[PDB]
Design an enzyme around this catalytic site. Sequence first.
Site, short mmCIF file in Angstrom:
data_model
loop_
_atom_site.label_atom_id
_atom_site.label_comp_id
_atom_site.label_asym_id
_atom_site.label_seq_id
_atom_site.Cartn_x
_atom_site.Cartn_y
_atom_site.Cartn_z
N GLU A 184 26.55 -7.91 -4.55
CA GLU A 184 26.47 -8.41 -3.19
C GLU A 184 27.85 -8.66 -2.60
O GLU A 184 28.09 -8.36 -1.43
CB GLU A 184 25.60 -9.68 -3.14
CG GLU A 184 24.08 -9.40 -3.31
CD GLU A 184 23.17 -10.63 -3.08
OE1 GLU A 184 23.71 -11.71 -2.72
OE2 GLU A 184 21.91 -10.51 -3.25
N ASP A 235 26.61 -13.96 8.94
CA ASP A 235 25.78 -12.99 8.25
C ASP A 235 25.13 -12.05 9.27
O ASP A 235 25.45 -12.07 10.46
CB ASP A 235 24.77 -13.70 7.34
CG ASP A 235 23.67 -14.41 8.10
OD1 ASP A 235 23.66 -14.34 9.35
OD2 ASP A 235 22.81 -15.05 7.45
#
EC number: 3.2.1.17
Length: 373
Positions: free
Chosen positions: A24, A33
Amino acid sequence: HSQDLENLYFQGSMNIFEMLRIDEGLRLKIYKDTEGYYTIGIGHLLTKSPSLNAAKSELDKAIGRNTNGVITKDEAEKLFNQDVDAAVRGILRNAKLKPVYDSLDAVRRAALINMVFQMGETGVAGFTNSLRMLQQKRWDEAAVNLAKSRWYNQTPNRTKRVITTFRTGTWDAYKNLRKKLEQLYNRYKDPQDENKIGIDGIQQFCDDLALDPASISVLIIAWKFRAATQCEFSKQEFMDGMTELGCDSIEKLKAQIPKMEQELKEPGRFKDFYQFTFNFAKNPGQKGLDLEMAIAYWNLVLNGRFKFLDLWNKFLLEHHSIPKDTWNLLLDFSTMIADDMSNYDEEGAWPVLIDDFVEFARPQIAGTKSTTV
Ligand SMILES: CCN1C(=O)[C@@H](NC(=O)c2cccc(C)c2)[C@@H](c2ccc(F)cc2)c2c(C)nn([C@@H]3CC=CCC3)c21
């Protein structure tokens, strides 16, 4: 303190944090995000508040100091380990996941936790047949069944590594990934500074990617790698970028270039790229961007987009540094301005440079209006 990483020194050096750092990625500064929410570390959501100060407040409560939005790798591991403990508690409460989790060895447990981070408990619990195979220690069959799934199609490189972890019960896939990226970085690194790739390495990188080093695609790659400064490509930039792009090879990065180009068709993403270019091109030791360097980058990034770019060049070439706000506002000018500049609002608080440009363009505009088609 309960969270001290020294309490994990009995473990192996490879662990779930290092696994998710590969799969990730790790961010040490607060960022937004996909949904616009302030996040840090390995996917640690701080708040849904639009206020950066609120996100900083939540971060300071979780870390124990005034971070101003920047943490260390060890601090990010402490945050992640708290998130792992919560995910494991959830797994143990889930009738569909507890039996398989309990049956697995520690390495394979990390692979299951990895899946839960990616797709949530409900998503992992959908893999009824593959989980039963894992519980029965039918490793090769589980690996084959997992590879048939949409999960594999969504994130093939991460999914292959997680599957190999289920297949073997070892960290081999992560050792191999690290070595591939290290050996690729070593092809490009500056022989006199192992912490960066220099101009020669960037040129080799471009050659390996079959890119004209003069193509805008090179700057697009630098943008996707969040490179701080032109003519350098730091080791962290290279590793973070290959991680976020899901690439462990030049062939895979080459296949990603058209996808990066496509992203720029969104005006919001082009604006991000355009604003990135200013900080990238500026000398770190200077506050503004030298006019000559600004012109060079403007001609690269605005050709075909700014209908007055040729006039802008002539205006500036007869001029005698560019601050960030002037750079940024040129794009807003380009977006709103009429084909004949007739809608310019002199009271709009545009930079003086742009006010002067509109006045300078008057002879050209008038001449065109009196020219026969
Ligand atoms: C084409 C605009 N560009 C850059 O994008 C530069 N890139 C970077 O450093 C770089 C940094 C980190 C990661 C990556 C992928 C790139 C640099 C350059 C290009 C090619 C090259 F093989 C070496 C250096 C550079 C130079 C020396 N000049 N510019 C020109 C600037 C303005 C107009 C045209 C090009 C370029």
